[PDB]
Amino acid sequence: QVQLQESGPGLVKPSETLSLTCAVSGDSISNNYWTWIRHFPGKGLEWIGRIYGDAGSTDYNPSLKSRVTISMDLSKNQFSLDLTSVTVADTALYYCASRTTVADNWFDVWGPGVLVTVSS
Amino acid sequence: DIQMTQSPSSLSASVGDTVTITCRATQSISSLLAWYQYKPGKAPKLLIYQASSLHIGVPSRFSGSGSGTDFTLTISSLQSEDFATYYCQQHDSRPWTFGQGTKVDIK
Amino acid sequence: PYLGFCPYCRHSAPCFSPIKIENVWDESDDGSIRIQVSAQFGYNQAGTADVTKFRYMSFDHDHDIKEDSMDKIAISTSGPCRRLGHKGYFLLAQCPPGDSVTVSITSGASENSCTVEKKIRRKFVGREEYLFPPVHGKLVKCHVYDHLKETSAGYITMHRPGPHAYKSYLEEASGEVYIKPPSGKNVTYECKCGDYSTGIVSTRTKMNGCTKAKQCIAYKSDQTKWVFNSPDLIRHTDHSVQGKLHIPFRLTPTVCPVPLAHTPTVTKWFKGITLHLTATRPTLLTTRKLGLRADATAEWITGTTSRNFSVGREGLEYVWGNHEPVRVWAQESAP
Numbered sequence: 150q151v152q153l154q155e156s157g158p159g160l161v162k163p164s165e166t167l168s169l170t171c172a173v174s175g176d177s178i179s180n181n182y183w184t185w186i187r188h189f190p191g192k193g194l195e196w197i198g199r200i201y202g203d204a205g206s207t208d209y210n211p212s213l214k215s216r217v218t219i220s221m222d223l224s225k226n227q228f229s230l231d232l233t234s235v236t237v238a239d240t241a242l243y244y245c246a247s248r249t250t251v252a253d254n255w256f257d258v259w260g261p262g263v264l265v266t267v268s269s
Numbered sequence: 270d271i272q273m274t275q276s277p278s279s280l281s282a283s284v285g286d287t288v289t290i291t292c293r294a295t296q297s298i299s300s301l302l303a304w305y306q307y308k309p310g311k312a313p314k315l316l317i318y319q320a321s322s323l324h325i326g327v328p329s330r331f332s333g334s335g336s337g338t339d340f341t342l343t344i345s346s347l348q349s350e351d352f353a354t355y356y357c358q359q360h361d362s363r364p365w366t367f368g369q370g371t372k373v374d375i376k
Numbered sequence: 377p378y379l380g381f382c383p384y385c386r387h388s389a390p391c392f393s394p395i396k397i398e399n400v401w402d403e404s405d406d407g408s409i410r411i412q413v414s415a416q417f418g419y420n421q422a423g424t425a426d427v428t429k430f431r432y433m434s435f436d437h438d439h440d441i442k443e444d445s446m447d448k449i450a451i452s453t454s455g456p457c458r459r460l461g462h463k464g465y466f467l468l469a470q471c472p473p474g475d476s477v478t479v480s481i482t483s484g485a486s487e488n489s490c491t492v493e494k495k496i497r498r499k500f501v502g503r504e505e506y507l508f509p510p511v512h513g514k515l516v517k518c519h520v521y522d523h524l525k526e527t528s529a530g531y532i533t534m535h536r537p538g539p540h541a542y543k544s545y546l547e548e549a550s551g552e553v554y555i556k557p558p559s560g561k562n563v564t565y566e567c568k569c570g571d572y573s574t575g576i577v578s579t580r581t582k583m584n585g586c587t588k589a590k591q592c593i594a595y596k597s598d599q600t601k602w603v604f605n606s607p608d609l610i611r612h613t614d615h616s617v618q619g620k621l622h623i624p625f626r627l628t629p630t631v632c633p634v635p636l637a638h639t640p641t642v643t644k645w646f647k648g649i650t651l652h653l654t655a656t657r658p659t660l661l662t663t664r665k666l667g668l669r670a671d672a673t674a675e676w677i678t679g680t681t682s683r684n685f686s687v688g689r690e691g692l693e694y695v696w697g698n699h700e701p702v703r704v705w706a707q708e709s710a711p
């Protein structure tokens with residue numbers, strides 16, 4: 150089966166590059182869509198972006214397009230998140246998502262997730 | 270961007286009752302909708318895909334319907350394990366959006 | 377499901393048809409062909425896996441999606457074809473020979489058709505020409521497309537569509553331009569009347585400095601549809617491959633029946649052989665020596681005739697039709 154695990158720093162200063170890691174186990178990286186999802190406490194879920202495995206094609210939310218860049222590492226079974234110049238509104242619970250279907254907005258799989266707090 | 274107005278925001282009900290939660294979209298999105306069940310301290314799980322179809326493992330008691338802009342989920346024979354947050358999600362426009370969340374709680 | 381530039385619409389002209397054929401493959405050994413069209417077969421407006429309905433590209437300014445059934449689908453090359461399977465862009469049909477193939481939707485009186493040049497011939501298996509497979513004969517390995525729809529012959533590449541502009545989106549009145557959108561849908565405009573300008577307005581809005589309606593371009597930001605890398609469309613500013621569906625009806629190896637010819641009547645003479653032959657259809661006869669020089673020859677024989685072949689001491693091997701090759705050896709019976 151496909152298992153996901155988030156692993157990122159929990160406390161980052163504002164106006165700093167946020168780097169978060171989701172590792173993939175049980176399946177290859179190159180034949181499924183890979184997705185980041187945020188979830189601010191006291192609010193709801195919001196889209197971040199996605200990457201395809203063997204192609205490296207990225208589609209991102211237009212509002213955050215200027216500050217979200219997604220890269221993947223096929224050797225480490227790895228795909229990553231880069232968020233530049235974080236603010237206090239970027240404090241959210243972060244999920245990495247994957248699906249049984251090769252590409253679907255709905256995600257069959259989901260990591261436990263990691264909490265990121267932006268404060269001084 | 271197609272925006273969402275989740276219905277209703279809150280509803281307290283006991284075990285065995287029937288609660289209906291509506292899903293209204295600002296634009297005609299045909300019947301491409303998916304619903305989620307958020308458990309606190311855990312990742313949300315898919316219950317209904319395609320606005321009428323059941324994910325394997327999900328209870329049959331859960332039945333969603335609707336097309337175009339108006340959608341409903343009917344939760345018949347409510348139990349203790351499914352007091353959660355309800356979230357319908359469309360997959361037409363990029364990127365996908367969410368509701369404001371519907372809270373159900375034990376009366 | 378996009379719409380393409382079909383070189384033959386209903387009447388005579390190159391026109392736009394939403395069941396536009398790009399290519400046709402005839403690599404099967406049973407005469408069946410597979411057809412790529414721009415429409416989606418076997419899916420509803422939402423794309424539900426449901427066999428009895430399909431969808432296509434609408435002929436209006438809102439560019440939505442409608443539905444239709446297969447009872448008004450006709451496949452033809454010279455006569456009507458027989459339908460066997462369909463997934464999305466893909467077809468499979470059994471057809472008589474012809475110089476082109478025709479797909480059509482006969483939606484009432486609106487018979488929108490598309491015809492693309494492709495030479496389809498009646499091909500055969502083995503060494504004997506045949507029209508319809510006989511009951512009796514040798515069983516031979518052949519290669520046909522599988523009728524199972526969930527197979528995978530390969531992959532095709534799809535990307536996001538580019539801007540698809542309209543004239544119904546733009547309005548001209550008393551020497552200025554206007555933009556009228558459908559209600560509830562954002563439209564991204566682009567116009568140039570001096571300084572280069574962009575923007576996204578979902579409501580009717582005056583634009584200043586413009587006198588001609590041929591200077592502003594408006595298009596809805598459409599991300600819902602996925603389009604094939606077709607030569608008939610303007611692509612988006614980034615050409616990244618984003619996904620891939622299977623190519624169904626994989627060309628699978630199967631056994632096929634082939635006929636057997638009539639067994640020839642063989643007569644004998646000194647250092648030579650003579651075969652009285654009979655075949656109502658063209659069949660192959662290949663003879664070769666068994667020594668230093670093969671002296672190989674091959675002919676397609678129609679009707680009945682007699683062929684003389686010299687046989688040496690080293691011998692000769694002749695193959696008549698689909699039968700077992702038979703080796704013959706001469707003697708030293710000089711008169």
Ligand SMILES: *[C@@H]1O[C@H](CO)[C@@H](O[C@@H]2O[C@H](CO)[C@@H](O)[C@H](O)[C@H]2NC(C)=O)[C@H](O)[C@H]1NC(C)=O
Nearest residue numbers: 211270271272560561562563576577578579597
């Ligand atoms: C499509 O048009 C609508 C209407 O302008 C935009 O709606 C905005 O939505 C956000 C989020 O709800 C609100 O905060 C704004 O107030 C709405 N408009 C305004 C001006 O207040 C919507 O963003 C548009 N989508 C795109 C992609 O432009």
Ligand SMILES: *[C@@H]1O[C@H](CO)[C@@H](O)[C@H](O)[C@H]1NC(C)=O
Nearest residue numbers: 655656657677678679680681
């Ligand atoms: C009839 O004879 C012609 C040659 O004159 C030949 O080409 C044709 O195949 C024959 N048809 C038959 C088999 O009756």
Ligand SMILES: *[C@@H]1O[C@H](CO)[C@@H](O)[C@H](O)[C@H]1NC(C)=O
Nearest residue numbers: 645648649650682683684685
């Ligand atoms: C074949 O050989 C026989 C016997 O020599 C002869 O009568 C006949 O004319 C020959 N026919 C051909 C095809 O040359």
